A paper describes a structure:
In this work, we show that unencumbered views of the changed, non-ground state can be obtained by recasting the problem as a multi-data set, 3D background-correction problem, which allows the relevant signal to be extracted from conventional single-data set density. Our new method—Pan-Dataset Density Analysis (PanDDA)—comprises: the characterization of a set of related crystallographic data sets of the same crystal form; the identification of (binding) events; and the subtraction of ground state density to reveal clear density for events. We demonstrate the power of the method by applying it to the most demanding type of changed-state study, namely crystallographic fragment screening, which attempts to observe in electron density the rare and often low occupancy binding events that occur when a relatively large (200–1,000) library of weak-binding ‘fragment' compounds (150–300 Da, 100 μM–10 mM)1819 are added individually or as cocktails to a series of equivalent crystals.
In contrast, PanDDA directly eliminates the thousands of strong electron density blobs with no statistical significance, objectively identifying only regions that are unique to each data set; the ground-state data sets are provided by the many hit-free crystals. Using an averaged ground-state map for subtraction, as opposed to a single ground-state map, reduces experimental noise in the ground-state estimate and thereby also in the event map. Finally, the averaging generates an estimate of the ground state that can be used directly as density, bypassing the need for any subjective modelling and map interpretation. All crystallographic data used for the PanDDA analysis must also be made available so that the analysis may be reproduced.
Author numbering: 701 to 878
Write the structure that this text describes.
């Protein structure tokens, strides 16, 4: 196994996957690393299994169909994994915890959103369709862009949105287009 957390790239109290070399902090893994379970397989491994069980699941899909899917166990897991891929980028720090808004010439968003709130909502099974999860993720970056206006800090929202969207297209096998 690796000697650093796959998510945050720090050492510490690490749980090791039994089927690949990755390791995790308890609350860095999504879902949080399970109490017992020997062997234990990490979310990367569980996603790879889904793909292997149904190779056709990698054929192209339309986004509109993916969004309307109900949050059955496999879609729950895919959302968890997509959330985790965003936390994997260090720039996710800016979007993890509850924001506050007090900048001359700007007004805060009507509906604040942040990664830890999405993580709690997934954990509590609050989303009934993929669309709910995706809407809240895209809302994080849209709120940021609107609030920061012409400040160059707006770019952080563009950057982490790009990581979200690339991973969304990969995990849900969105049909490639020009
Ligand atoms: Zn970690
Ligand atoms: Zn693994
Ligand atoms: Zn199949």
């Amino acid at each position: 196994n690796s000697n650093i957390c796959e998510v945050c790239n720090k050492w510490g109290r690490l749980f090791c996957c039994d089927t690949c070399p990755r390791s995790f902090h308890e609350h860095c893994h999504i879902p949080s690393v399970e109490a017992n379970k020997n062997p234990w397989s990490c979310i990367f491994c569980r996603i790879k299994t889904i793909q292997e069980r149904c190779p056709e699941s990698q054929s192209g899909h339309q986004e509109s169909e993916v969004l309307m899917r109900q949050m059955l166990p496999e879609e729950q897991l895919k959302c968890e994994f997509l959330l985790l891929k965003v936390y994997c980028d260090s720039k996710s720090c800016f979007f993890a915890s509850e924001p506050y808004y007090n900048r001359e010439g700007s007004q805060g968003p009507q509906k604040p959103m942040w990664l830890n709130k999405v993580k709690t909502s997934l954990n509590e099974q609050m989303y009934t369709r993929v669309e709910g999860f995706v809407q809240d993720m895209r809302l994080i970056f849209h709120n940021h862009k609107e609030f920061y206006r012409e400040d160059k800090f707006t770019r952080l929202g563009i950057q982490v949105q790009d990581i979200f969207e690339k991973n969304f297209r990969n995990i849900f096998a969105i049909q490639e287009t020009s």
